[PDB]
Amino acid sequence: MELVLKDAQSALTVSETTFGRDFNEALVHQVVVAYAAGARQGTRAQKTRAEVTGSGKKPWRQKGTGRARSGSIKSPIWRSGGVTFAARPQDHSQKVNKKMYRGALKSILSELVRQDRLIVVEKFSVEAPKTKLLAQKLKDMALEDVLIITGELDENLFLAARNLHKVDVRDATGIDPVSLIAFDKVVMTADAVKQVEEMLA
């Protein structure tokens, strides 16, 4: 399909399958959920009745005592020692098929174009590594929360946006569904656009 520009007014040709396909609600949600789960690290643990410091001696005899039968000071129904099902460090990452990941990414890109949240422009660069310059460049464009995607990563643009929370700078290869969804506006360079079709295929 045809992607219009706002600065050079130059036509761009892009496959409609990767930019004009329908929006799959179910597929995108699964990929987004999978991405969040993969961000976890699951560094937690408790002590079961075997790992609690203590001794296995019976608190009192089985019979004769007027109280409830007890077996150990570390039973889960006892104060200061227990946890019936203690947690262990686990991996929460889940598998997502390559095609499913690509399909969700294609679905997300198409809808950004449909909601005009995606803006394609020519090369986006800053002459000097100054956050002030980048802020001015984004101010006249009426953009405050933007994800800058460029074909080639340059330290000059990387340093300029480092201290800008609402602004992110990324490469085409390092593109994730969550970032595209989260950011209000996405700006893609002409080079950045081309690499997307090649990797998306």
């Binding site: 608190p59 009192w60 004769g64 005592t65 007027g66």
Partner: peptide, 17 residues
Amino acid sequence: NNRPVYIPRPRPPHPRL
């Protein structure tokens, strides 16, 4: 507050009705 009881008791004549 536990105070374990170590008091054995005498064996009475079992009912053995």
